[PDB]
């Protein structure tokens, strides 16, 4: 449940939902917001697996 | 006629447009704290029917209002900073057949046996008008008036009552209207032709949803160590 | 006489402790 809950976190991004980031922003900005989310989700998976 | 009443745990409302079912949701919003001081204002307020006096109360980051007035003495609310024609203000008047919400540089003119008259003969530079169904129309007629990010959000609930001043049960208010008024509204005044006024504070509440989309119970996480524990565990049973 | 052919105690143990990803449909199976 914690691992799923981490998906709603923004991790500094404008939005927690990738569809909204891609829907509103051009690729060069979306990549920044997406990378912030990738970092947060990847850290959440490493914590879960450990 | 102001008596503090410290017993109330009322004023919970649906914080958002999201439907929830069989969950406990922990949320932070402006709520009336449980067991907070709610000033009780007292037929026709502080004056008798012939007399006039209106406290012109502060609006401290949102106001909880209630009044079980079967005579419909209360007709509306005035929000603004002066209310003397110099600034923009929001007037909400329930005329039994409709409700008229207006924004203008309204001037208070002692606006109210069983005599009735018009109000606000001065109404310059009007910028906003909205109409809707009766807000008030034996019923407690609970309301929450909140102003944030420009929007003036009004929530309400009608809870029939006969033998008590307040029902013994729990209720949550549903939004009634949400208007983009853009008025600072530091203070407010009651429009009278048994009133309870409380103030909202930023707080975190644990809200219990039923199988249907309704709030049936709530915990004020800052009231007592037990409520705090309940919020920490996100359970109503510890 | 019972389906699963468990002993009375095993049936009690299984009843006391509480395939389709209806929950947590976020890549977690």
């Amino acid at each position: 449940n914690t691992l799923v809950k981490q998906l709603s976190s923004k991790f500094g991004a404008i939005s927690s939902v990738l569809n909204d980031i891609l829907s509103r922003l051009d690729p060069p900005e979306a990549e920044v917001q997406i990378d912030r989310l990738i970092t947060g989700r990847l850290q959440s998976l490493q914590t879960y697996v450990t | 006629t102001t008596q503090s009443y410290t017993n109330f745990t009322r004023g919970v409302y649906y914080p958002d447009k999201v439907f929830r079912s069989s969950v406990l949701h922990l949320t932070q919003d402006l709520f009336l704290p449980f067991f907070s001081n709610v000033t009780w204002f007292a037929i026709s307020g502080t004056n008798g029917t012939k007399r006039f006096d209106n406290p012109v109360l502060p609006f401290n980051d949102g106001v909880y209002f209630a009044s079980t007035e079967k005579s419909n003495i209360i007709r509306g609310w005035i929000f603004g900073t002066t209310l003397d024609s110099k600034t923009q203000s929001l007037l909400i008047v329930n005329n039994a057949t409709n409700v008229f919400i207006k924004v203008c540089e309204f001037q208070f003119c002692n606006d109210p046996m069983e005599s009735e008259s018009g109000v606000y003969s001065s109404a310059n530079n009007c910028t906003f008008e909205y109409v809707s169904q009766p807000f008030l129309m034996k019923n407690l007629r609970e309301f929450v008036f909140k102003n944030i990010d420009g929007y003036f959000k009004i929530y309400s609930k009608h809870t029939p009552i006969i033998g008590r001043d307040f029902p013994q049960g729990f209720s949550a208010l549903e939004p009634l209207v949400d208007l983009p008024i853009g008025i600072n509204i530091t203070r407010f005044q009651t429009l009278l032709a048994d009133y309870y006024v409380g103030y909202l504070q930023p707080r975190t509440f644990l809200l219990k949803y039923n199988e249907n989309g309704t709030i049936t119970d709530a915990v004020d996480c800052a009231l007592d160590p037990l409520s705090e524990t309940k919020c920490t565990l996100k359970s109503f049973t510890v | 006489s019972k389906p699963s052919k468990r002993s009375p105690i095993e049936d009690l143990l299984f009843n006391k402790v509480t395939l389709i990803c209806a929950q947590k449909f976020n890549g977690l199976t």
Partner: protein
């Protein structure tokens, strides 16, 4: 080697897209704001509310080529694909030298004295040279700027009231040596250079709060198809799933539903007010059962 190995995952793909918006035919008054015959000053900026309309932004490109069209929270290209809560148009005439200062987080005389954007800002700052309309040899009466403000403005604060600023150490009532006069209106001549030349700026303030209202761009809707894996856009909410008839008892108030883990699991149809459940499309892992390459190339 002989065994079962997990390789790729499988997903059922959508077959069609569903686009649903309320049937609003009223167009947003962008030409009344941009093409107005008279504009408010930068100090007294005009805040026009745009709502209950179709936010078709092609009309701005029809209006004029622009010197600036800087969107901070959105891409200019994608405005026609979004829905907004409460679009606000802040319209004013400013000096060219301060046009670049109309941005989130900036410090300077215009940001501090007349008009500030919040540091957390979603919207677009649109500006163009306006010499062809308001440049006069006698000088107009439209310019009105705060020369010196008593304190910094908050985002979207408009200090309309005019008061004398105390420059000295004592109260002053119209006496030059101690009173600083708070306004700098000026008439403009067509012969002044670009930094002095007026620019007309319109700021479109957007709040993308999961579309509780409409103000949606010019998208054509399709029919609603249920019991299939589809892509969908429900009043700006974008996703993929299977839509079914809902048994949830929504109050007239709620528009969208969420699960215990805050993912979306229900929507209100923007045209029919039908409540639909969103079931994710079938997905799972794929395992390959191999007898071993040196035995047989058959797999399951």
């Amino acid at each position: 080697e002989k065994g079962i190995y997990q390789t790729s995952n499988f997903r059922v793909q959508p077959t069609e897209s569903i686009v649903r918006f309320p049937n609003v035919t009223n167009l947003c008054p962008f030409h009344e704001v941009f093409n107005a015959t008279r504009f408010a000053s930068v100090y007294a900026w005009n805040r026009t509310r745009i709502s209950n309309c179709v936010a078709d932004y092609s009309v701005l490109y029809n209006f004029a080529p622009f010197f600036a069209f800087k969107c901070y929270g959105v891409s200019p290209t994608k405005l026609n694909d979004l829905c907004f809560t409460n679009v606000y148009a802040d319209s004013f005439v400013i000096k060219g030298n301060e046009v670049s200062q109309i941005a989130p987080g900036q410090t300077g005389n215009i940001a501090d004295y007349n008009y500030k954007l919040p540091d957390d800002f979603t919207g677009c700052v649109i500006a163009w040279n306006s010499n062809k309309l308001d440049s006069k040899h006698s000088g107009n009466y439209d310019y009105w700027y705060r020369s010196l403000r008593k304190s910094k403005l908050k985002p979207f604060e408009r200090d309309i009231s005019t008061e004398i600023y105390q420059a000295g150490n004592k109260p002053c009532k119209g006496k030059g040596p101690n009173c600083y006069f708070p306004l700098q209106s000026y008439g403009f001549r067509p012969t002044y250079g670009v930094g002095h030349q007026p620019y007309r700026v319109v700021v479109l303030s957007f709040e993308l709060l999961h579309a509780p209202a409409t103000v949606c761009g010019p998208k054509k809707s399709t029919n609603l198809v249920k019991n299939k894996c589809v892509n969908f856009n429900f009043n700006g909410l974008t996703g993929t799933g299977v839509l079914t008839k809902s048994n949830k008892k929504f109050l007239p108030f709620q528009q969208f539903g969420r699960d215990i883990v805050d993912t979306t699991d229900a929507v209100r149809d923007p045209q029919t007010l039908e409540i639909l459940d969103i079931t994710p499309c079938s997905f799972g892992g794929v395992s390959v059962i191999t007898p071993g390459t040196n035995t047989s190339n058959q797999v399951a």
